[PDB]
Design a protein around this ligand. Sequence first.
Ligand SMILES: CCC1=C(C)/C(=C/C2=NC(=C\c3[nH]c(/C=C4\NC(=O)[C@H](C)[C@H]4CC)c(C)c3CCC(=O)O)/C(CCC(=O)O)=C2C)NC1=O
Ligand SMILES: CCC1=C(C)/C(=C/C2=NC(=C\c3[nH]c(/C=C4\NC(=O)[C@H](C)[C@H]4CC)c(C)c3CCC(=O)O)/C(CCC(=O)O)=C2C)NC1=O
Ligand SMILES: CCC1=C(C)/C(=C/C2=NC(=C\c3[nH]c(/C=C4\NC(=O)[C@H](C)[C@H]4CC)c(C)c3CCC(=O)O)/C(CCC(=O)O)=C2C)NC1=O
Ligand SMILES: CCC1=C(C)/C(=C/C2=NC(=C\c3[nH]c(/C=C4\NC(=O)[C@H](C)[C@H]4CC)c(C)c3CCC(=O)O)/C(CCC(=O)O)=C2C)NC1=O
Ligand SMILES: CCC1=C(C)/C(=C/C2=NC(=C\c3[nH]c(/C=C4\NC(=O)[C@H](C)[C@H]4CC)c(C)c3CCC(=O)O)/C(CCC(=O)O)=C2C)NC1=O
Ligand SMILES: CCC1=C(C)/C(=C/C2=NC(=C\c3[nH]c(/C=C4\NC(=O)[C@H](C)[C@H]4CC)c(C)c3CCC(=O)O)/C(CCC(=O)O)=C2C)NC1=O
Ligand SMILES: CCC1=C(C)/C(=C/C2=NC(=C\c3[nH]c(/C=C4\NC(=O)[C@H](C)[C@H]4CC)c(C)c3CCC(=O)O)/C(CCC(=O)O)=C2C)NC1=O
Ligand SMILES: CCC1=C(C)/C(=C/C2=NC(=C\c3[nH]c(/C=C4\NC(=O)[C@H](C)[C@H]4CC)c(C)c3CCC(=O)O)/C(CCC(=O)O)=C2C)NC1=O
Ligand SMILES: CCC1=C(C)/C(=C/C2=NC(=C\c3[nH]c(/C=C4\NC(=O)[C@H](C)[C@H]4CC)c(C)c3CCC(=O)O)/C(CCC(=O)O)=C2C)NC1=O
Ligand SMILES: CCC1=C(C)/C(=C/C2=NC(=C\c3[nH]c(/C=C4\NC(=O)[C@H](C)[C@H]4CC)c(C)c3CCC(=O)O)/C(CCC(=O)O)=C2C)NC1=O
Lengths: 49, 66, 162, 162, 162, 162, 162, 49, 160, 160, 160, 160
Amino acid sequence: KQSAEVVVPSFKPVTSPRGMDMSQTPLMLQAMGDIAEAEQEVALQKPLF
Amino acid sequence: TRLFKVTALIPSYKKVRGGRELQNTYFTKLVEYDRWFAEQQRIQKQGGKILSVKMVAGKPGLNTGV
Amino acid sequence: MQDAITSVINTYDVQGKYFDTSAFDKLKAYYATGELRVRAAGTISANAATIIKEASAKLFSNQPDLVRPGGNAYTTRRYAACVRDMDYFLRYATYAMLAGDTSILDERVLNGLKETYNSLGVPISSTVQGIQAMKEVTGSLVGSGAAKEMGVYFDYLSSGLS
Amino acid sequence: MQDAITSVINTYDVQGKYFDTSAFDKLKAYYATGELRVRAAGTISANAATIIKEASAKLFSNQPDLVRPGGNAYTTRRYAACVRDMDYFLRYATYAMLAGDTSILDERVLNGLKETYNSLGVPISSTVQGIQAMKEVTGSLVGSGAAKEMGVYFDYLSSGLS
Amino acid sequence: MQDAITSVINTYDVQGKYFDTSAFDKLKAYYATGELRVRAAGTISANAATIIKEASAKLFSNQPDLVRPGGNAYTTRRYAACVRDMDYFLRYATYAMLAGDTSILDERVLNGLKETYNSLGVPISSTVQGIQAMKEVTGSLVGSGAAKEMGVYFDYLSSGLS
Amino acid sequence: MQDAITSVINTYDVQGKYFDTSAFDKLKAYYATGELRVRAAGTISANAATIIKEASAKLFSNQPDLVRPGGNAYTTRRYAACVRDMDYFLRYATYAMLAGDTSILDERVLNGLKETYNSLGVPISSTVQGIQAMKEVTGSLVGSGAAKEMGVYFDYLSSGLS
Amino acid sequence: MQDAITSVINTYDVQGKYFDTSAFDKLKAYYATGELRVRAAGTISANAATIIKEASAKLFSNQPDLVRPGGNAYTTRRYAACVRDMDYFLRYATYAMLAGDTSILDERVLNGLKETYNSLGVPISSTVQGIQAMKEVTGSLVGSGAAKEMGVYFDYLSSGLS
Amino acid sequence: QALASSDLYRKQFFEPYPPTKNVELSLKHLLGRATKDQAELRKYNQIIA
Amino acid sequence: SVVTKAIVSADAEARYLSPGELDRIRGFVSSGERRLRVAQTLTESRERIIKQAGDQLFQKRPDLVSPGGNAYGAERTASCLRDLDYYLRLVTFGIVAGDVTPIEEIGVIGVKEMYRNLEVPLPGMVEAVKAMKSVATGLLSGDDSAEVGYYFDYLAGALA
Amino acid sequence: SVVTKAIVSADAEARYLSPGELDRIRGFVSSGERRLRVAQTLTESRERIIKQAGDQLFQKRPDLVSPGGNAYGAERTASCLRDLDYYLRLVTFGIVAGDVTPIEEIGVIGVKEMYRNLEVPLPGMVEAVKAMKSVATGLLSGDDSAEVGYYFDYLAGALA
Amino acid sequence: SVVTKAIVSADAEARYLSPGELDRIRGFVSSGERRLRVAQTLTESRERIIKQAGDQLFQKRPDLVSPGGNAYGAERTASCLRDLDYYLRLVTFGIVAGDVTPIEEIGVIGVKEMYRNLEVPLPGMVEAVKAMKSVATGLLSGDDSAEVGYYFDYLAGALA
Amino acid sequence: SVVTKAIVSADAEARYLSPGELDRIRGFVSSGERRLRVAQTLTESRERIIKQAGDQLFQKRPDLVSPGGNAYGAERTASCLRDLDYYLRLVTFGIVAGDVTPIEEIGVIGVKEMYRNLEVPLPGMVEAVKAMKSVATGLLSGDDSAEVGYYFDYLAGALA
Ligand SMILES: CCC1=C(C)/C(=C/C2=NC(=C\c3[nH]c(/C=C4\NC(=O)[C@H](C)[C@H]4CC)c(C)c3CCC(=O)O)/C(CCC(=O)O)=C2C)NC1=O
Ligand SMILES: CCC1=C(C)/C(=C/C2=NC(=C\c3[nH]c(/C=C4\NC(=O)[C@H](C)[C@H]4CC)c(C)c3CCC(=O)O)/C(CCC(=O)O)=C2C)NC1=O
Ligand SMILES: CCC1=C(C)/C(=C/C2=NC(=C\c3[nH]c(/C=C4\NC(=O)[C@H](C)[C@H]4CC)c(C)c3CCC(=O)O)/C(CCC(=O)O)=C2C)NC1=O
Ligand SMILES: CCC1=C(C)/C(=C/C2=NC(=C\c3[nH]c(/C=C4\NC(=O)[C@H](C)[C@H]4CC)c(C)c3CCC(=O)O)/C(CCC(=O)O)=C2C)NC1=O
Ligand SMILES: CCC1=C(C)/C(=C/C2=NC(=C\c3[nH]c(/C=C4\NC(=O)[C@H](C)[C@H]4CC)c(C)c3CCC(=O)O)/C(CCC(=O)O)=C2C)NC1=O
Ligand SMILES: CCC1=C(C)/C(=C/C2=NC(=C\c3[nH]c(/C=C4\NC(=O)[C@H](C)[C@H]4CC)c(C)c3CCC(=O)O)/C(CCC(=O)O)=C2C)NC1=O
Ligand SMILES: CCC1=C(C)/C(=C/C2=NC(=C\c3[nH]c(/C=C4\NC(=O)[C@H](C)[C@H]4CC)c(C)c3CCC(=O)O)/C(CCC(=O)O)=C2C)NC1=O
Ligand SMILES: CCC1=C(C)/C(=C/C2=NC(=C\c3[nH]c(/C=C4\NC(=O)[C@H](C)[C@H]4CC)c(C)c3CCC(=O)O)/C(CCC(=O)O)=C2C)NC1=O
Ligand SMILES: CCC1=C(C)/C(=C/C2=NC(=C\c3[nH]c(/C=C4\NC(=O)[C@H](C)[C@H]4CC)c(C)c3CCC(=O)O)/C(CCC(=O)O)=C2C)NC1=O
Ligand SMILES: CCC1=C(C)/C(=C/C2=NC(=C\c3[nH]c(/C=C4\NC(=O)[C@H](C)[C@H]4CC)c(C)c3CCC(=O)O)/C(CCC(=O)O)=C2C)NC1=O
C-alpha cells in the first residue's frame, strides 16, 4: 500500500516515428540505383523500333 | 467430477540439474477438473509420461454439481 | 456438491424430463425443513468450539492412552491435528445437514480419508468414537429433531471411516 | 516428439552406426512426399471447422443417443468438450502427417488420454466412430494420397483409444 | 515489431490505400538490399565472440578504471554482465539491420535502458564508447557498404543511450 | 469498495458515535431508492450487449473517422478494445449505481486511465463522447427515475476522464 | 531425518521417560564415534570428485555396454545423469555416516527411487554394482575403521535399491 | 494457486485496483516480474474483462 | 442452488455460514412454495409456450425458416422447437433452484461453441428466448412474471 | 454490506448481478425498516444493556474484578465496559449493514493480537459477549432477537 | 513479414539467426519480385474482384440481403462490399509481406468481437472470402493462384 | 528438425501451421536433397577425416599423447579417436536434420560434466573439433564447406 499508482500503464507504441525515413540510407540509395539498371535492361529487352 | 488424482513421471531432457529433482519427476497430485486439460497438456509438452489418472471426489456422468 | 434440490434436478435432467408431482413433493419436503436446518446450523456455529472441547475431553477421558506418551495424540502437534480433524468433521457435517445431502461429505471428507489415516497410523475406531462424542454433544445441544438430522450425517461420517 | 528424419537419426544413433544407403533412401522417401504433406496440411487447416462440423454431424446422426439426455455428449458443456476433443484429434493428426511419424500422437495425444476417458466414462467406441468420421470427411477433402496418409494417423488414434 | 515491409504496409494501412508505384519501388529497394543484409548478418553471427572480445578490449584499455577494483565492471559478475550487454547490443543491431528498421531498437533495447543503467550506476558514456568500439570492429568484418549500414543501427543505439 | 450504507457506517465509526437520526435518515433514503436501483440494474443486465451496440454505433456515426483507416478504433483489434472499454464503463457504472457510491469507479476504473490512454494515444475526448453515448442509451432504457441516478455515475466517469 | 541422538530422544519420548543409565550409555557411544565420523566426512569431502571418478571408471570398466550406444548411460546427458546420481549417493552416505543413522537415506534418496528408475528404464542391478564400486573406492581412503561404518550405509543404499 | 485465487487475495489486490494494476501486481506476486510487454497486458486485460 | 453457493463460499474460507448467508438461506426456503408454484405453472403450459414462442420466433426473424436459413426444413424446425423445450425446462430448474447455476451448467457453459459448431445464429436464439420470455410471462402474474423474466433475461444475455 | 458483497462477487466473475443476487439485494432493501428499528432499540437502550452485561459478566467471572484480574480497579472496569460498548455499536452497524462485515473490519480482524498485547483473556470476551447477547435479545421480539443473536454469535465465535 | 518472424523466433531463443533462417530470408527476398507482381495484379483488378465476389456471395447466400439479413439495404450492402475491399487489401499486404502477419494484426485479432458487436454472421464472412478466393485465383496463373489461395484460406479459417 | 520446431511452435499457440511455416517446411524439403548429398560425402570419408584429424590434434597437442596425458596409451588414444568418430557421426546427423538439435541432444548436454569426470581437457576437445572441421571442409567443395563448418563451429562453441 505504498502507492496506488500504476507502474506500467501501457507501453508507448513504436509503430511510426517522426522523420528519419531511412530512404536516404546509402545502401537503400544503392538499391534505388540498381533498380534503375534493371528497368533499363527490361527496356532494352523490347524491340528496337 | 471436480478432482483427478494424477500420477505422472516427468523426465529431464533440456539439462542435468544440480538439484536432486527426485521431487519433481515422479509425482502424484490432485488437480481439479477444469484444470486437468491444461495440466495434461503441459505435462505432455514437457515430455512426461502420464502413468495414471483416477476419479476421487466427484461422480462421472453427473450433470449438476459440477 | 449436490444439495437436495440439485440432486432432484440432476435426476430429472439425466432423465431429460420436466418435474413430476413426486419431484415437487421432494422439493416441498426440503423447503419445509429448511428453517429447522438453518436454526440447527446457527446453533452449531454458535457453539462449535464448545462442542469440540467437550467432545475431545470425552474422547480422551474414555481413551486416556491416546494423549499419554505412545498414543497417536501425544504431542502438541498431534493433539492439535486431532482437534483440527474434529473441527473439520463438525463443520462439514453441518454443511451436509444444511445442504440436506451427504455428497459434500464423501466429496470433501471421505475420499481417501481411510487410506490417509491408515498410512499415518491414526486409529480409525478412536476417530469414530470422537465422531460419536461430537454427535452426543451436538444432539444434546441442538434439540431432538435437529439432533436426529445431525446424527444422520454424523453416522454417515462414522460409516465412511469404519 | 520426433519426425521421420529425427526418427531415422535416433534409430541409427541407438546402434551407433552411420547412415547406410537405406537410411538415405528413407530420407529421400520423406523429402519426396513432403510437398504433398504441405498441401494436405494447408487444406486441412483451411477447413478444420468444416471437417469437425461434418464429422460431428455424422457421429451424432449415427449415434443419436449421445446428445439426447443421458448421453455422454448431453449438455452444452459436454458437447463442447466432445467437439474440442475432435478438434484436437484432427489438428494433432495433421501434425503427425506433416512430421511423417506417429510419435507426437504418443507424446501429446495418447499420453494419458485412455485412462482420462476411462475415469470420465467417455465411451471408447463412440470416440473411435468420431475419429473414423473425421477420417472419411478429411480424405474426401484432401484427395487419394493425402487421404491414405491422414488415414494412417487416424487409425493410429483409433487403435490407441481401442 | 516492424521491418521495411511492415513499415510500408503500415503507412499504406493508415491511409486505407492499396499499394501505389512508390510503395512497390520501396519494396523493390528492400528486396534488392536483402542479399547484402543476409550476408552481413551471417558474417556478424559467425564472428560475434571475436567482436565482443575486441570491443571490450578497446573499451577496457581506454577506461581501465572500469576493471580496477571498485569499477563498475570489476567483479566476475559485473564483467560478465558487461560483455553480455555488449552481446545484446550486437544481436539487436544485427536484427535491426536485417529488418531494415530501427523500431526493434526502441522497442527491445532502448526502452528503459537509460534509467536501468542510472539505477545500477552503469556509466552510460562508457557504454556508448563500447558501442562505438563494437561498430569499428564490425565495420572491418562486414565490408564498406555493410559497414555504413551497420553504423546506422549502432549510432541509433548510441544516440538513444546518450 | 464502499457503498452508501458502508459510507454512513464509516463516517460514524471515525467519530465513534452510535447512529443518530441523520444517519438513520440517510439509511432510509438509500433503502427507499434500493428497489429502483435493483430494477435498473436488472434492466441493464438484460440489455447490456444491446446498449453497447447502440452506443458504439452512435459514437462511430458522430465520429466516423475513429473507425475509418487512421482512426484509433480502426482495426479489428482496436475496435474490439474500444468495445471492451465501453463494457468496463457500463458494468462499473451499474455497480456504482447499485452501490449508491462512486468509490468503485475510483478504485477499479479511474485510477490510471489517463496514463494508459495517453500512453496508447487513445483520444480521451472521444472516449468521453462514447461514455455520453452510453449515458443517453442507458437512460432511455432504464426510464425517467433511474436515468437521473445513472447519469450521476456516467458523468462522474466522464469528469474523471476529463 | 533423525540422527542417533534424536533416535534415542524419540525412543524415550514415545515411552515418556527421562534418560536413564542406558540412554546416557548409548549417547556416550555416539560421542565416542563422533571424532572418527567427522574425520571420515572431511576426508570424503576433500576427495568427492576423485572417489566418483574411480567409482564410475570401475562401473563402466566392468559393464562397458552401459556407455556404448544402446546402454542407458549412452549420451552426454545420460552419462552426466549417471555420475550425478553416484555423487548424490556418496554425499548422502556421508550425511548418514556423520549422523550415524540411516533414516536420511530412506527419507531423501530411496523414497520413490524404484518408481522413478523403473519408469525411466534405469537398470537397478548396474546401479547397485555402482554402489558397491563406490564403497570399495571410499574404503581405501577413509581408513580401515571408518571404511566398515561407511560400508554400512552403502549396503543400506544398495539393499534399498535392490 | 489456492492462495492466489482466494477471497483474501481478491480483497487485497484485485478489488482495490484497476485491472492494469491487477495485472502488474499479480505478475509480481506469481511470476516474480512486472508486466512484460503490451501483448501480455492485452491478454490479461481481456481475460479480466 | 442458493444453499450450494452459500456452502461453497463458507467452505472456501473454512468458516461456518455467516448471518448473511443463513439469512439468505431463510429467504430462499421461505419463498420455496411460491417459486414451486411458478415452476408447476410453467410445466403444465410447456407445449403451448413452446408453440407460441416458435411462432413469434419465425414471425420476427424469417431468415431462419427462409432458404439458406438454419431452421429451413421440417426436421430442423422440430429441432428448433426441441431446443426451446430444453431451455424452458432449464428455466424451471433455475426457478426451483433459486439461482442460475442449473441453467449455466446444463445449457450455458459451452453453448457458444456448440451453436457455432451447428451454424445456429446466436441473435436468432436470443430472439427465441425473448419470445419464450414474452409468452411465459404472459401466463404468469406480475410478481411471478418478474422472477421468471429475470431468469429468461439471464439466458438471453448469456446466449448472446 | 449485502450490496457490496453482491457487487464484489459479481465483479470477481466480470459479470452483472445474477437473478439470485438481485433478489437478495431486493429482499435486503425491503427489510431495511425493521433493521433500522432494531438499531433504534439497541441504540436507545445501550447504557442499560452495557450495565446489565457487565453485571452478568462480573458475577459469572469474579476473577476479572478481583485483585490480580485484568478488569480489577475502577479504570480497568471502565475500559471493560467501554469495550462492551464498542462491540454493541458494532452489532448495530452490522444490523444496518445486513452482514457482519462492519463488525469484521472494525472489531474482528487482529482482535486476537490486540487482546494478547493487552493481556485481556479471550474466554472473558466470549462470556461478556454472551451476556450482552442475552441482555440485548431480552429487549427485542423473537424475530428480531434471533437475527441479532446471530450477530452476537458471530462475534463470540470470532473471539473464541 | 518473413524477416519479422525469423527475427522474433531468434529473439525468443536469445540467439542469432541460423543459416537455415537466413536461407529462408534469402529465398523470400528472391521471390519478392514475383510477390510484387501478384500484388499488383490483385490491386489493379480490385473493383472487379469486389463486384464479382459480392455477386457470388449474394447468389450463394440470399438471406444476407433478404429482409432480416445483415446486408439488407443499399447502405448495408455498401458496407459489406467495403469490408470485402478491406480484406482484399489485407490479402495483398500479406502477399508482399510473405506471411499472414499483416492480415492477422489488421483484420483477424478481435474480429469475432467486432462482428458480434456489429451483428455480422461469420459464416457470411467465410462465404464472402471464399467468393473472393474463387474470383482472385481466376485472375492468376496456377503457381501464383495457389499462393494467393493460401492467404485466402487462412482468412477463411480465421473467420471460421 | 525444422519440421519438429515448426510443429512445436504451432502447438504452443494451439494453432495450425501458418502459410509462412508451411512455406518454411517447403524450403526445408527442397534443400533436403543437397543435405543428404553432403551427409553422404562426409559419411564416405569416415576414416580419412578421423585419421588426419587425429594426426593434427596429436602433433598440435603432443601433451595429450605424452606421458601423463589423458590419451596416453594405445587404448586411450583409441578412445580419443572413438570420441572423434562419435562427433563426426553427430555432425552428419546435424547435416541431415538441418539443425544442431541432434548434436545438442546426443553430445552437448552435460558434456562438460562428462569430460570433467573423465579428466578430458576441454581445449583438447576444441582443437580436435577444429581439426575435424578443417579436414571435412577440405574434402568438400566451396558450397558444402560453409554449412558443414557451421555445425563444427557450434560443437566447438559448446565444448568451449
Ligand atoms: C537425491 C536423491 C535423488 C536421486 C539419486 C535421484 C536420481 C534420478 N536419476 C534420474 C535419471 C537418470 N539416472 C541415470 C543413472 C543410471 N543410468 C545408468 O544406467 C547407471 C547404471 C545408472 C547410475 C549409476 C540416468 C542415465 C538417468 C537419465 C534417464 C533418462 O534418460 O531419462 C532422475 C530423473 C530426472 C533427471 O534426469 O535428473 C532422477 C530423479 N533423484 C533424486 O530425487
Ligand atoms: C509433550 C507435549 C504435550 C503436552 C505439553 C500436553 C499437555 C496436555 N494437558 C492436558 C490437560 C491439562 N493441562 C493442564 C495445565 C495447566 N493448568 C494451569 O492452567 C497451568 C497454566 C497449566 C500448566 C502449568 C491442566 C490443568 C489440564 C487439565 C484440564 C482438564 O482436563 O479439564 C491435556 C489433555 C488431556 C491430559 O493429558 O490430561 C494435554 C494433551 N500434551 C502433550 O502431548
Ligand atoms: C477436510 C477434511 C480432512 C480431514 C478429515 C483430514 C484428516 C488428516 N489428519 C491428518 C493428521 C492427524 N490426524 C490426527 C487425529 C487422529 N489421531 C488421533 O489419535 C484421533 C484418534 C484422531 C482424531 C479424532 C492426528 C493425531 C494426526 C497427526 C498424524 C501424525 O503426524 O503422525 C492428516 C495428515 C496431514 C497433516 O497432519 O497436516 C490428514 C490429511 N484432512 C483433511 O483435508
Ligand atoms: C440442455 C442443453 C442442450 C441443448 C440446448 C442442446 C441443443 C442441440 N441442438 C442441436 C441441433 C439443432 N438445433 C437447432 C435450433 C436452431 N435452429 C434455428 O437456427 C434457431 C436459431 C435455433 C432454435 C431456436 C437446429 C436447426 C438444429 C439442427 C442443426 C443441424 O442438423 O445441422 C443439437 C445437435 C444434435 C441434435 O439434433 O439434437 C444439440 C446438441 N443440446 C443440449 O444437450
Ligand atoms: C490433447 C489431447 C487431449 C484430449 C483429446 C483430451 C480430452 C479430455 N476430455 C475431457 C472431458 C470430455 N470429453 C468428452 C468427449 C466424448 N464425449 C462424446 O461422447 C465423444 C464420444 C467423445 C469425444 C468425441 C466429454 C463429453 C467430456 C466431458 C466429460 C464430463 O465432464 O463428464 C477431459 C477432462 C478435463 C476437461 O474437459 O477440462 C479431457 C482431458 N485431453 C487431452 O490432453
Ligand atoms: C576480482 C575478480 C576479477 C578477476 C579475477 C578479474 C580478471 C581479469 N584479468 C584480465 C586480463 C588478464 N588476465 C590474465 C591471466 C591469465 N594469463 C594466463 O593465461 C593465466 C592462465 C591466467 C592467470 C593465472 C592475463 C594474461 C590478462 C591480460 C590479457 C591481455 O593482455 O590481453 C582482465 C582484463 C582487464 C585488466 O587487465 O585490467 C580481468 C578483468 N577481474 C576481476 O574483477
Ligand atoms: C481492416 C479491418 C476492419 C474491418 C474488416 C472492419 C469492418 C467494419 N464493418 C462495419 C459495418 C458493416 N459491415 C458489414 C459487412 C457484413 N455484412 C454481411 O453480412 C457480410 C457477411 C459481411 C461482409 C462480407 C455490414 C452490413 C456493416 C453495416 C452494419 C450496421 O450498420 O449495423 C464496421 C462498423 C463501422 C463502419 O461501418 O465503418 C466496421 C468497423 N473494420 C475494420 O477496422
Ligand atoms: C476498468 C478500468 C480500465 C479500463 C477502462 C482500461 C482500458 C484499456 N484500454 C486499452 C487499449 C484501447 N482502448 C481503446 C478504446 C478507445 N479508443 C477508441 O478510439 C475509443 C474513442 C475509445 C473507447 C470508446 C482502444 C482502441 C485501445 C487499443 C489501443 C492500442 O492497442 O493501440 C488497454 C490496453 C490493453 C488492450 O488493448 O487490450 C486498456 C488496459 N483498463 C483498465 O484497467
Ligand atoms: C472497536 C474495536 C476496538 C476494541 C474492541 C478495542 C479494545 C481496547 N481495550 C483496551 C484496554 C482494556 N480492555 C479491557 C476489557 C477486558 N477486561 C476484561 O477482562 C474483559 C474480558 C474484557 C472486556 C469485556 C480492559 C480491562 C482494558 C484495560 C487494560 C490495561 O489498561 O492494561 C484498549 C487499550 C486502550 C485503553 O485502555 O482504553 C483497547 C484499544 N479497541 C478498539 O479500537
Ligand atoms: C555420443 C556422445 C558421447 C561422447 C562424446 C562420449 C565421450 C566418452 N569418452 C570416454 C573415454 C575417453 N575419451 C577420451 C578422449 C580425450 N583424450 C584426450 O584428452 C583428447 C583431448 C580427447 C579426445 C579428442 C579418453 C582419453 C578417454 C579415456 C578416459 C580414461 O580411461 O581415463 C567415455 C568413457 C566410456 C568409454 O571409454 O567407452 C565417454 C562416455 N560418450 C558419449 O555417449
